[PDB]
Design a protein around this nucleic acid. Sequence first.
RNA 1: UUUUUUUUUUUUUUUU
RNA 2: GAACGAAAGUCGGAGGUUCGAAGACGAUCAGAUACCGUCGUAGUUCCGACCAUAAACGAUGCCGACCGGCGAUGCGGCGGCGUUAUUCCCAUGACCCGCCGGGCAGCUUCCGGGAAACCAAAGUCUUUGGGUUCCGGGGGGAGUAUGGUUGCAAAGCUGAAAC
Lengths: 215, 55, 81, 97, 222, 25, 129, 125
Amino acid sequence: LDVLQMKEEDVLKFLAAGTHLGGTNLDFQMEQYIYKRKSDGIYIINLKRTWEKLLLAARAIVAIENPADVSVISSRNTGQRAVLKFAAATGATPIAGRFTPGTFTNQIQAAFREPRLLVVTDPRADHQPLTEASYVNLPTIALCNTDSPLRYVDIAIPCNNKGAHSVGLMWWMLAREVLRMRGTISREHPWEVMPDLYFYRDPEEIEKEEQAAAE
Amino acid sequence: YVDTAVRHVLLRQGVLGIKVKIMLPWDPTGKIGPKKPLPDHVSIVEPKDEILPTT
Amino acid sequence: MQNDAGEFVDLYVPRKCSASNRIIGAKDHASIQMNVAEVDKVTGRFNGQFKTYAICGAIRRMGESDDSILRLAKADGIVSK
Amino acid sequence: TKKRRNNGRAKKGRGHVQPIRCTNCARCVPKDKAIKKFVIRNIVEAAAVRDISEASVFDAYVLPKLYVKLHYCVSCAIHSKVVRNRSREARKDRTPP
Amino acid sequence: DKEWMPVTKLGRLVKDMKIKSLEEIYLFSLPIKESEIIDFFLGASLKDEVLKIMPVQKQTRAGQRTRFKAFVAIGDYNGHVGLGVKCSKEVATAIRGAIILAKLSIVPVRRGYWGNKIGKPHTVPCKVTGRCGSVLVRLIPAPRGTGIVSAPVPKKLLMMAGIDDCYTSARGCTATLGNFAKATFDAISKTYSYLTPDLWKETVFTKSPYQEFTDHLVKTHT
Amino acid sequence: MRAKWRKKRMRRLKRKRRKMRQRSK
Amino acid sequence: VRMNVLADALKSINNAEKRGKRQVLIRPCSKVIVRFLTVMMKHGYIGEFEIIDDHRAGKIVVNLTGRLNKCGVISPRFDVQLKDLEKWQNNLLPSRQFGFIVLTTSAGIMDHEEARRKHTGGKILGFFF
Amino acid sequence: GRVRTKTVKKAARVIIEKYYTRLGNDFHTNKRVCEEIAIIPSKKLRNKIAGYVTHLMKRIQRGPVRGISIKLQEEERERRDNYVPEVSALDQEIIEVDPDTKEMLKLLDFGSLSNLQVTQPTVGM
RNA sequence: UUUUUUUUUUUUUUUU
RNA sequence: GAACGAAAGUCGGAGGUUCGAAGACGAUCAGAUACCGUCGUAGUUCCGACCAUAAACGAUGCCGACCGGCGAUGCGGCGGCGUUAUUCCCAUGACCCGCCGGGCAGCUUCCGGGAAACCAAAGUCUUUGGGUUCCGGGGGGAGUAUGGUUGCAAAGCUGAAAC
Ligand SMILES: [Mg+2]
Ligand SMILES: [Mg+2]
Ligand SMILES: [Mg+2]
Ligand SMILES: [Mg+2]
Ligand SMILES: [Mg+2]
Ligand SMILES: [Mg+2]
Ligand SMILES: [Mg+2]
Ligand SMILES: [Mg+2]
Ligand SMILES: [Mg+2]
Ligand SMILES: [Mg+2]
Ligand SMILES: [Zn+2]
């Protein structure tokens, strides 16, 4: 271990998206991923144990040779920007939009896949893939919040999943950590893409108006 | 499309009639069936946008 | 199972689970074969080897697997000291 | 079998609740079984308050209310169309919108 | 003689001949789904029985709809059985649909000794029982040269497996062949799911056919 | 005929059968 | 109320094995219950255990292995005269060479097949497999 | 009763998914554009399609029609995939957020560069 | 507000 | 073996509003002696005796041991230098966030069980043995005939057989 460990730049980004504090109410299986209660009810997620689970999840994706057998899901629409651009980086075959129950089971279906791993985003907003994961013997990484329980989840990353910048940060440092195990760019070297792609875009009340203000 | 016949059969129980209708499919030419296409079945063309931009 | 003649008749060894030590059956289609990669020394580069985890169904349903993976990585000693 | 887990009423720790005499048919139904509502009905129907707002001495200072503990039984409830049928999952459900 | 209609990437390993035997699937519990899969691996599960057809009657407004409910139970005499139920509207269609669903749920059957350690295992390894509906079909191991002492239907199901000798018991509605054949079938899948005091070992974990032939899956996914 | 009023008719019959017994003892 | 406390213990391990847990507690002890687990330890179906000394009557914490399917008690403790164990062999243990039966013999708590090596026998404590 | 059938809407979406480069706002030209680029075996079905497609055209200029999004908007959608402004990944590098996260950042091994200080009551939710 | 009531023996299921 | 045991009744005592069995009446129907309407006994009510039945229902014997969660709540106990009422430390009030115990209930769950509905007990069951009491054995005849036994009586407890 000890050489992939966190630095002051990493926790500068994590504390910027607001993913250190979670929901008011938890899964009971979320016992080990909490540091202290707080006023407002909000729960201080400890960050070394997020990084423990980000350490495994990068080890999970790289473990298979063929990267094109990774299916990545988002049903709710904060990470449908993220999944389509996370997959644009590494090897994943993105299923954004609606899930179409029976994507894995019936062999009479056309748009029909058989991956070796699944990456979902919000386990309460994605109950159908986690149910379908138990039919074709495939493991599942999930970006779990506190109130999200853990049925057919394997690699839970404690975070917030209701925010916009909160979700997309995890996708950024995952793929960066995934590529770091593929052998691309050092720890002791900076990175080239900047996470505002992966995070989210709102309706462009700001985005075209920030481009209209930057005229 | 639907050619149809009825015939008689005299059996060891009594009599039987048989009905066989067969929908002749459409090829646009052939002794397979009628040359008129299926009125529900509307098929389309292919795209040809492979090359060129202003020179 | 071997007899007094030491005879291998027995068909296969089914994948016994990691946490439960329970047998995964043939038609138990909610089993899992998890595989987490090795990393190197100081370089932090991919060793071309790995360690294999197999979990059974009733662990997988009840949420118990998530305690089982990281503690087995701790039983490996690959996630904490 | 059991159509309900309540078996209708809401006697759970007790053994006996007093009956409340019903309003329509006046059949005595124990009150944790009975259909129960509370209407803040205005004393004059709102089309005719505008008559009385303009024929009054005060500056519409007089506005009184009519409170009735209006108390039904379950036979005369549906008979008066309050407590509509629902479905086998919809019996589980709670407070209206 | 037809082309195999390859699909679903687990049938496609077989026509690459990069899965040795069907045992190489029973380890890893991958869902067998087409019927021509195990027909490749078995020219020894050729024995099957149409167990019982019985009509079921849907009271429609005009007339009541008969539709037939066939049962098919396949079996290798070495230990590979499966029991399929298919209901479609006709006799011939119900059986041919039940052939496939029996080929779906084929399971391996473990056979152990009565209690001497000479050779040639012949009976069930322990006292198992299966429950489907109300029926409990208890299989109790038998000495060498017993026969399958049983009701006529589940004896026939074990006769297609390769159990020489087995004691049985059955309590419940034995008059229904939907349950009594499925509850027999439930127990003879449990012969591997039940433990044993000779499997203490932390196992070895061989590699998956997805894992090992992934480069062979590269050229065959393209 | 309800089991309620079946019990009532067996009662009503038995009471006359009783007053017949006690009459001519 | 609290009677036949061997039956107390062997429901605790049974409910924790079928739940699949790791380590259990049994809130009373006995030299009955120490030697019965000592039978199970010597055969290895369950792991290490450790008795927390309470000054009144202690507790037992068992590291489970995960082998067990059923750990029971014969409830009135029928007496066993010899050549009647093959009856209990057919009755209780599932196969012909699996499982054991725990006996209360004249020279202590023994095992099923260790009892007829002693050729003494005695009352039952239970069964496990 | 203008409640046009699936196979009108079936073709009219494959109208828009193949040859958009010929269609316009106009009905009385697309009524004859439809003939040159399709197979219409009925003359009422000539009008029935063409009135629907040009009625669909005033939405395609207007808003996203969900069945298929046109080749401008696909690449255009990517345009909304690769909009990269590089400013606001992070706020100031001296963050103060919680007194409780001070017990985080002290006791979890760091340099603890940024101080944390707010205080509240505990009447949350 | 009614809205009461209509007798009898009569119904077989494999397969390629 | 014993005490408690709703309403209904039985015996005597006080009075007797309303409701109201029977009872009489008006309609409504072919018929109503029924619903509907009006008058109204016994009864309701209080005081000393009786009787021991119900859908007396969680239609789930009681004690214990174990096996998932959360959200509350009712009664006690401890803690939480955030308010607020006496006068302001000083006590308790009033909320607020807790953790403990036992309590009526709930939500969800593939713990498993269940013929199923459903069930955290109806689970720990053919992998069957915690301790202990009452009981059912195809529907009818029937808790009927007859015996004993109690009750002033109405009736209770015990309980067949032919067919
Ligand atoms: Mg019913
Ligand atoms: Mg009551
Ligand atoms: Mg029978
Ligand atoms: Mg009437
Ligand atoms: Mg009284
Ligand atoms: Mg008197
Ligand atoms: Mg007097
Ligand atoms: Mg009166
Ligand atoms: Mg309190
Ligand atoms: Mg009792
Ligand atoms: Zn009423």
